[PDB]
Amino acid sequence: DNTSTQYKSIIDITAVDYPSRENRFEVVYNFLSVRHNSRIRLKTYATEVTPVPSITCLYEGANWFEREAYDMYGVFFEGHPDLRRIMTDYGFEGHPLRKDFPLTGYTEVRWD
Amino acid sequence: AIIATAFAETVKFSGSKQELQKRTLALYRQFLRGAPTFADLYEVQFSIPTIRTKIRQEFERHRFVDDLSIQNVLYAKGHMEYQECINFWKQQAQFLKYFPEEDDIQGRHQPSNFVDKFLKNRA
Amino acid sequence: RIRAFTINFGPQHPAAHGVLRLILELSGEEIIRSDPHVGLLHRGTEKLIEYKTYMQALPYFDRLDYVSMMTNEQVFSL
Amino acid sequence: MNTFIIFIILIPIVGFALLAVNILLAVYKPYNEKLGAFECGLTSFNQTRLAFNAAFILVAILFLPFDLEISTLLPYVMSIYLVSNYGFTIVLLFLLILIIGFVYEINTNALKINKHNKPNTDSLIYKL
Amino acid sequence: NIYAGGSAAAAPPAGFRIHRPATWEESEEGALSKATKYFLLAEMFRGLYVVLEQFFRAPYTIYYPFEKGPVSPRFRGEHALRRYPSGEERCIACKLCEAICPALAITIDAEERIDGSRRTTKYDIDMTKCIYCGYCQESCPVDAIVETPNVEYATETREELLYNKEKLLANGDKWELELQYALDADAPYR
Amino acid sequence: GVSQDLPAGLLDDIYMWATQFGDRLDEIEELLTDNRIWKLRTVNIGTVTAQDALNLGLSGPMLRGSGIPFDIRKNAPYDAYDKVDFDVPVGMNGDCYDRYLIRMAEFRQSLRIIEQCCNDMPAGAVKVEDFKINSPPRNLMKEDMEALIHHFLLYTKGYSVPPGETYTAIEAPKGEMGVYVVSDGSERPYKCKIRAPGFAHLGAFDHIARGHFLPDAVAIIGTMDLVFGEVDR
Amino acid sequence: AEKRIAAVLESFDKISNPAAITPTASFAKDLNLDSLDTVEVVVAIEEEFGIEIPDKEADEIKSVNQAVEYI
Amino acid sequence: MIINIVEILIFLVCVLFSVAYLTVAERKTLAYMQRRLGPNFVGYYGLLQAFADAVKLLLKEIVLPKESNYIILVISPLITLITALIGWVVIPLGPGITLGELNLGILFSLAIGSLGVFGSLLSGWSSNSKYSLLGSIRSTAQLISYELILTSIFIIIIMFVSSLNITTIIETQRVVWYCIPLLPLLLIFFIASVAETARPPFDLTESESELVAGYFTEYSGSPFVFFFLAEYSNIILISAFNGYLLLGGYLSFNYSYLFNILFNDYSYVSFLFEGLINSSAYAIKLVFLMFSFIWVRAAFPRFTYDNLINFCWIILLPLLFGIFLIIPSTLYIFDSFPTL
Amino acid sequence: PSVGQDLPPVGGYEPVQWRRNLPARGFRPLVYLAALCGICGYGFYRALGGIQERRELKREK
Amino acid sequence: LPGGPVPVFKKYTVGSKGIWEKLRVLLAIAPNRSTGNPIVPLYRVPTPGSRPEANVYQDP
Numbered sequence A: 001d002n003t004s005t006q007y008k009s010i011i012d013i014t015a016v017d018y019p020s021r022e023n024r025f026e027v028v029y030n031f032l033s034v035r036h037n038s039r040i041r042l043k044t045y046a047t048e049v050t051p052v053p054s055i056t057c058l059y060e061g062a063n064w065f066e067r068e069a070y071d072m073y074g075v076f077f078e079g080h081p082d083l084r085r086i087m088t089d090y091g092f093e094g095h096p097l098r099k100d101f102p103l104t105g106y107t108e109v110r111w112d
Numbered sequence B: 001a002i003i004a005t006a007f008a009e010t011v012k013f014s015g016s017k018q019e020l021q022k023r024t025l026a027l028y029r030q031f032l033r034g035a036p037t038f039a040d041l042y043e044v045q046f047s048i049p050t051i052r053t054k055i056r057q058e059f060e061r062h063r064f065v066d067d068l069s070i071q072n073v074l075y076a077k078g079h080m081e082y083q084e085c086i087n088f089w090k091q092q093a094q095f096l097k098y099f100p101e102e103d104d105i106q107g108r109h110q111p112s113n114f115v116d117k118f119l120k121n122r123a
Numbered sequence C: 001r002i003r004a005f006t007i008n009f010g011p012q013h014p015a016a017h018g019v020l021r022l023i024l025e026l027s028g029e030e031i032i033r034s035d036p037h038v039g040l041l042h043r044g045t046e047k048l049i050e051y052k053t054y055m056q057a058l059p060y061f062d063r064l065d066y067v068s069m070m071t072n073e074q075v076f077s078l
Numbered sequence D: 001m002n003t004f005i006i007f008i009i010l011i012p013i014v015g016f017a018l019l020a021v022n023i024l025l026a027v028y029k030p031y032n033e034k035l036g037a038f039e040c041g042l043t044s045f046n047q048t049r050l051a052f053n054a055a056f057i058l059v060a061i062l063f064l065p066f067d068l069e070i071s072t073l074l075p076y077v078m079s080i081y082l083v084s085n086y087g088f089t090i091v092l093l094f095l096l097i098l099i100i101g102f103v104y105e106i107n108t109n110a111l112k113i114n115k116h117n118k119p120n121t122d123s124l125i126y127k128l
Numbered sequence E: 001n002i003y004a005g006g007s008a009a010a011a012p013p014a015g016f017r018i019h020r021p022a023t024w025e026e027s028e029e030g031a032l033s034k035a036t037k038y039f040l041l042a043e044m045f046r047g048l049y050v051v052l053e054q055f056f057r058a059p060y061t062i063y064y065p066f067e068k069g070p071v072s073p074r075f076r077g078e079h080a081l082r083r084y085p086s087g088e089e090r091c092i093a094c095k096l097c098e099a100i101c102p103a104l105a106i107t108i109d110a111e112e113r114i115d116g117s118r119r120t121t122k123y124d125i126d127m128t129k130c131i132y133c134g135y136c137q138e139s140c141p142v143d144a145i146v147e148t149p150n151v152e153y154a155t156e157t158r159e160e161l162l163y164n165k166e167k168l169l170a171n172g173d174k175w176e177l178e179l180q181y182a183l184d185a186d187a188p189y190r
Numbered sequence F: 001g002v003s004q005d006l007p008a009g010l011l012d013d014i015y016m017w018a019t020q021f022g023d024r025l026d027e028i029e030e031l032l033t034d035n036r037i038w039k040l041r042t043v044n045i046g047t048v049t050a051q052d053a054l055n056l057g058l059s060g061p062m063l064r065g066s067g068i069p070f071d072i073r074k075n076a077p078y079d080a081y082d083k084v085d086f087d088v089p090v091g092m093n094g095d096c097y098d099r100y101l102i103r104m105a106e107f108r109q110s111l112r113i114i115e116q117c118c119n120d121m122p123a124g125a126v127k128v129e130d131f132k133i134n135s136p137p138r139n140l141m142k143e144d145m146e147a148l149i150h151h152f153l154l155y156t157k158g159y160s161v162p163p164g165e166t167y168t169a170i171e172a173p174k175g176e177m178g179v180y181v182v183s184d185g186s187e188r189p190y191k192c193k194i195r196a197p198g199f200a201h202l203g204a205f206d207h208i209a210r211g212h213f214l215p216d217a218v219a220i221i222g223t224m225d226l227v228f229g230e231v232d233r
Numbered sequence G: 001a002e003k004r005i006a007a008v009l010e011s012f013d014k015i016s017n018p019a020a021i022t023p024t025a026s027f028a029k030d031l032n033l034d035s036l037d038t039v040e041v042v043v044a045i046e047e048e049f050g051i052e053i054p055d056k057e058a059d060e061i062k063s064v065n066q067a068v069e070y071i
Numbered sequence H: 001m002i003i004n005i006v007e008i009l010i011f012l013v014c015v016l017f018s019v020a021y022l023t024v025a026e027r028k029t030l031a032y033m034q035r036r037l038g039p040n041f042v043g044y045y046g047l048l049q050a051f052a053d054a055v056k057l058l059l060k061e062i063v064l065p066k067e068s069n070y071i072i073l074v075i076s077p078l079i080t081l082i083t084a085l086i087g088w089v090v091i092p093l094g095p096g097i098t099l100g101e102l103n104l105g106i107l108f109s110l111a112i113g114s115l116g117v118f119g120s121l122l123s124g125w126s127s128n129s130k131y132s133l134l135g136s137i138r139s140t141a142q143l144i145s146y147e148l149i150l151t152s153i154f155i156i157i158i159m160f161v162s163s164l165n166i167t168t169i170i171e172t173q174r175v176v177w178y179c180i181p182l183l184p185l186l187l188i189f190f191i192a193s194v195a196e197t198a199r200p201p202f203d204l205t206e207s208e209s210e211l212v213a214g215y216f217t218e219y220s221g222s223p224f225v226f227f228f229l230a231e232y233s234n235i236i237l238i239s240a241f242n243g244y245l246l247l248g249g250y251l252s253f254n255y256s257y258l259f260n261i262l263f264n265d266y267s268y269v270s271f272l273f274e275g276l277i278n279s280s281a282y283a284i285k286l287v288f289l290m291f292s293f294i295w296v297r298a299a300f301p302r303f304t305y306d307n308l309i310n311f312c313w314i315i316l317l318p319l320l321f322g323i324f325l326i327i328p329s330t331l332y333i334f335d336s337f338p339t340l
Numbered sequence I: 001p002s003v004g005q006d007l008p009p010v011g012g013y014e015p016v017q018w019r020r021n022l023p024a025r026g027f028r029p030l031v032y033l034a035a036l037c038g039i040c041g042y043g044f045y046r047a048l049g050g051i052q053e054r055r056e057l058k059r060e061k
Numbered sequence J: 001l002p003g004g005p006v007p008v009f010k011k012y013t014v015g016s017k018g019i020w021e022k023l024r025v026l027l028a029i030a031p032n033r034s035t036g037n038p039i040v041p042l043y044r045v046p047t048p049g050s051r052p053e054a055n056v057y058q059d060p
């Protein structure tokens, strides 16, 4: 909302897992200003139990991105209206983009 | 705008364990009340009491967790699971993941002592 | 009280393109709430790329928007 | 026993014969999953009857008076010469009366389904 | 000049504000011409005519499998293992194909042959894992593993699509001439 | 760069295809652009305002239809887009019909650029000329020791990327396509997240489709130009 | 009428004295029913009578007497 | 009796095979409009394609869903096909050359036609799905709506003739086909016939609905054959209505002079030749109308339900009422009320 | 160097057509309206003449 | 205006000859429009597997 910045479009939100840090997860926001033809990135941090404030109040487009970040990493977003899995199977246990989640997971399906 | 769906609760981390206890008992009530709806949606073989028993066992599993943050996450995920079950978003296949005991006997040999486990290279 | 009627538009539906599960709520004619369920084609590509060399990861980008293969390649290459 | 009656009897016979052939030759192996209603591959919950719009009712109800209006002109077209100018005047009066009702239907917008949700057009005002 | 919160490129371009929409009373066409277009479906008739013109043009269809679509020397089809003109295998088990394979479709085993040669004792491709990318063929230092132009090898059982070394060598023997056309056309470009 | 050079007769064939693609476009436009039924299905269907388009993360036609002149090829030029001449179509009603017109004009502009590339294609290499990054040509690989070593290493270990991170975006056919890649200095990316325009478009569906009829929803899905491999990666 | 409530709350586990259900008996004090058990018995009551009970009123229920007073 | 049986067998075979080959013609014509070939492989030049589809379907298992009134779902398509075929009993291929020479033939056409909505209406009830009920409701509303238009045009034509005998209506067009003074009615009748058969661009129910493929979504085997056959049979029959109401039926040109040159007296040869000329005229008109159905399918996108209901009740019906006024007025002005 | 590379012609290729080419065809709308009026009027002339002669045939019968 | 219409004989598509060309010109919505069928002797000839340039190509 500042006149010299005017970053009106939210481009993406994701997380990056850094298992060596005390706060595992860094949350990354990318923003675009069509007014000034400019981009900017904003980082914060989180753990498996400490949430982040949802930015859906500021950008509606953020909604699904935060859901994906919750689904892949387990980061919670405080104030998110409808926060649930968006990618994984119903009842899927785990957050697959964590460095300790194995590549092929734990379970497989078949017809019985 | 982008509006929430049926039985969606905005994520709020309770600042106190008592204010979480209220929400948690309310979620337990919701699950117990939805049990018959579950038995109808998912065409289950077993009885409504079996579903409610399973729900009790699930809530029992975390009866002694102390850290407030962990309880907050357990509650938010339990509510996600309630929303998934009550909206029929789940199919029968994923819903029946919760009831492994309800399936029949898998075989004659489930070892319990050391020798039986050792004969199957599971010691 | 308005009572929504809920329809699964897809996945096995010509307009839903085989993989979209668009859960719609109608009051008569009109859509009042829409809930697209996705992940019916979630392949875990982003997890797989972390186990690949950059050269080995390039062909995963062909298979994202699989009518626009070369521009997908182009963004990864840039 | 002219061709008319024989043809009219013959048609249902052929339909029933094709049905019988299909019953006799196709396999028949019902089972629970096959017996489900096809709704895009998923299952939906049983629901109270959908609330419908009034235009759906109104098209079907208004079909009957308009259909009767149209069908009441059959005696006129079968008697036009006999009743020539007097009946021509009478049928004009009858048509005009029915057209007044058509006018009522058109001006009341009786068969229009209005999209309940409309874009907001209110100005944005700030109390400085 | 000096801008505050802006710039010359964020200034609106000349003419960015659109002209006001015209009303009905400022129309060039009289109402009768418009009604003629409206009731007689003029543009719909133009569309029908365009469709009808196609009906008298040559169709594009080819009569597969009696005719065949275009194929190029670079095309990536079913895999084969090649020989030297002497008949010796070209593969010396460097395992570069196995290392590069993005789908991990290749499984290789090697040891010293009783004549001392470095050669494979096992060369497997899971054709149901393979993505037909051609990376193995690029990686090979001796042109041993190749993709033929053959696409017509559908099977009735999945077990038939796990190619072992015998199957791949037989493919090389079977397709060597077509492979030589393709190589003679594309080797300078690799 | 690219993995191989163009074969010998390709520029001529692309040019001959280009000499008739314009007519191919005209006939589709004959069927659609002025058809009153097409307009009944597209005009004022799936309307998005410019401010809401920005707030929802829409890009490409989904944005240009609302009147905003933004296109990465002109705003942040990459590979050779600065060297070619083309125009950018911008809508004003933010509906399905404006987006259809935008896509049809983009057909023509792509034909323009393809012709300019057929006329201005220069000589030289097609991949970067450092064999630590890209593999050397095969006749060097089978004659020169350094070339063989570099080929072996590139196909077994891969090149190492300096540590760091980037978000890189292009004007893909469906809107802004981005990648956020984090390098830890090794041969394998530490993190790679794909920003698919279809993801944000389908996210905006619930805001755009409210209050429409079901066939309008079919039309809106079609106007978003969704491919679902993009959506769920 | 109250006898139906006594029947509903009699057929539950963890209680070894079926005759201990006096019209003013508290679940947490007499029966030794857990918080979860209290929710279960409240749900069983409201299901037996077919009535839905709101959140605040349901939580404030703590005894047989309050159950009848609301019944 | 014998002659009656032979005539009925000939007429029935011709109608059923014409219906079978209309599906092949649609596939081929759409194909060549789309720069492809269409069926050219099952039989020579793809001439056995329809029979392959029919045999395949006749050997396909019938599925009765669980919540389904199985009797109603198996009899609904049967009755639609039966009424669709019964409609052919009054179509003449020459003066009086028909299976049923009814003085009330037009009325028969309209009544059997009005029995055509029950398939859509009953098919949705066949199951217990609310998707199905809504789709059937819409399709039924469209069907009765355009039934009004077709009936109005019938009555407008009878204003010129004052007869319900189809042969007589055709015979009065030896002076001029009724499409010449009433050309807008030709356009309107074709549009309404396409809508009444629920053909594109009037195919809401099958192609934009909750169920994937209309109210036939649940049909397999011979019930599907019944619905498909009834649809194409109604296409040809409604085109025959168009032909005798507006296109002069079996009339082409005056061949009196040519026949007087060729023949010197009545014979089975002259009778056969006159019959061939009449039938070929009616057949070629039917061919043009079938081609037009397919061509319109090739050229246009679909309406929505709201669009088509508006088209029928706000645009077409008011014009038809205005025509109700203007036709008897013109007959009165010039003293041209038709006698019986 | 560069030997054997695909390259453009020295003069370049002739320009291709890329702008919209949908030329207007057909008479002005009022011509079609006039033709429709003429067709319908001639048809009405014939149909009313036929009706009148049919009535005289009815008198004779 | 560059990009404007070019005649049909400057487009590498088969088209018609003789009396049929006169008929097509009389009956076309737009006479300058091509049919879309590539000219067989000119298009993708010689085939990519028999290019002479392959035997002179060097790494650039």
Ligand SMILES: CCCCCCCCCCCCCCCCCC(=O)OC[C@H](COP(=O)(O)OCCN)OC(=O)CCCCCCCCCCCCCCCCC
Binding pocket: E032, E035, E036, E038, E039, E040, E041, E044, E048, F036, F037, H184, H185, H187, H188, H190, H191, H194, H201, H292, H295, H296, H307, H311, H315, H319, I033
């Ligand atoms: C000038 C004085 C005139 C005097 C009165 C006229 C006398 C009668 C004229 C005969 C023709 C009348 C019937 C056609 C009228 C169509 C009018 C129309 O355009 O309907 C438009 C309707 C939407 O309604 P509206 O709101 O008015 O449109 C504004 C859109 N912004 O939306 C629609 O319904 C679209 C139009 C429907 C087209 C149906 C297409 C189905 C098949 C097309 C048939 C084409 C011919 C096929 C035969 C093959 C060719 C040989």
Ligand SMILES: CCCCCCCCCCCC(=O)OC[C@H](COP(=O)(O)OCC[N+](C)(C)C)OC(=O)CCCCCCCCCCC
Binding pocket: H326, H327, H330, H333, H334, H336, I040, I041, I042, I044, I045, I046, I048, I049, I052
């Ligand atoms: C509102 C309508 C106003 C139209 C006014 C037009 C009058 C023009 C003068 C020509 C008449 C003429 O001279 O031809 C006379 C004709 C035919 O009769 P006849 O046998 O040749 O005459 C001999 C008299 N006998 C039989 C006693 C010996 O009669 C007609 O019916 C044709 C009228 C032209 C058609 C007008 C219909 C207009 C379209 C209506 C759409 C709703």
Ligand code: SF4
Binding pocket: E097, E100, E101, E102, E103, E104, E105, E106, E125, E129, E130, E131, E132, E133, E134, E135, E136, E137
């Ligand atoms: S083509 Fe690609 S995926 Fe297939 S074996 Fe070769 S390297 Fe592996």
Ligand code: SF4
Binding pocket: E090, E091, E092, E093, E094, E095, E096, E097, E098, E108, E139, E140, E141, E142, E143, E144, E145
């Ligand atoms: S096929 Fe080639 S790359 Fe693969 S192991 Fe053999 S020699 Fe090495």
